[PDB]
Write a protein that binds this DNA or RNA. Structure first.
Length: 183
DNA sequence: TAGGGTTAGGG
């Protein structure tokens, strides 16, 4: 058994009439659901337009994500890896992005180093090992852009990432302005 | 379209 958090998917854009039962009825087509629920307003009991489905195994979760697009109750919904309550606190933790910031990479880090660790998550579109525009010095971080936002999500939910022999920190890439707006 | 009475004691 893997952690509950890694076996759970967030399902956004739920139709106004989607219920625990209709949600379950759709996603069970890809595996055993150990949990399924539509978040509602504790007051009006009105649906908040989002929910969560949790499979018995991450393998089933991967099958579901490979089954996109998902149309539930006549509405195309938006499934995403479930981000923990703790991480949902960080700026832009719920953004749909295809690029990741990789910080703490050794000076002698080359692109092949990044590929040997990251390709396992999805198709890589661009790899950028950052250097100072002027001195040519290596700055110790890179940007890796994927073909699918789910690749990035599968990555940021894990804790450790080993590149060029040592762990590195991976975050969703925030724009220059999003960086400022967060600072 | 970010969570369900689900987050810092008392010694």
């Amino acid at each position: 058994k893997e952690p509950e958090q890694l076996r759970k998917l967030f399902i956004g854009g739920l139709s106004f009439e989607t219920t625990d039962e209709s949600l379950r009825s759709h996603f069970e087509q890809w595996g055993t659901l150990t949990d399924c629920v539509v978040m509602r307003d504790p007051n009006t009991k009105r649906s908040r337009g989002f929910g969560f489905v949790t499979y018995a195994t991450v393998e089933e979760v991967d099958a579901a994500m490979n089954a996109r697009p998902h149309k539930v109750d006549g509405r195309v919904v938006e499934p995403k890896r479930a981000v923990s309550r703790e991480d949902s606190q960080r700026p832009g933790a719920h953004l749909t992005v295809k690029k990741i910031f990789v910080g703490g990479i050794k000076e002698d880090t080359e692109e092949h180093h990044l590929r040997d660790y990251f390709e396992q998550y999805g198709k890589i579109e661009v790899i950028e090992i950052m250097t100072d525009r002027g001195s040519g010095k290596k700055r110790g971080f890179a940007f890796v852009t994927f073909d699918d936002h789910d690749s990035v999500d599968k990555i940021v939910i894990q804790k450790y990432h080993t590149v060029n022999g040592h762990n590195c920190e991976v975050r969703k890439a925030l724009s220059k302005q999003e960086m400022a707006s967060a600072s």
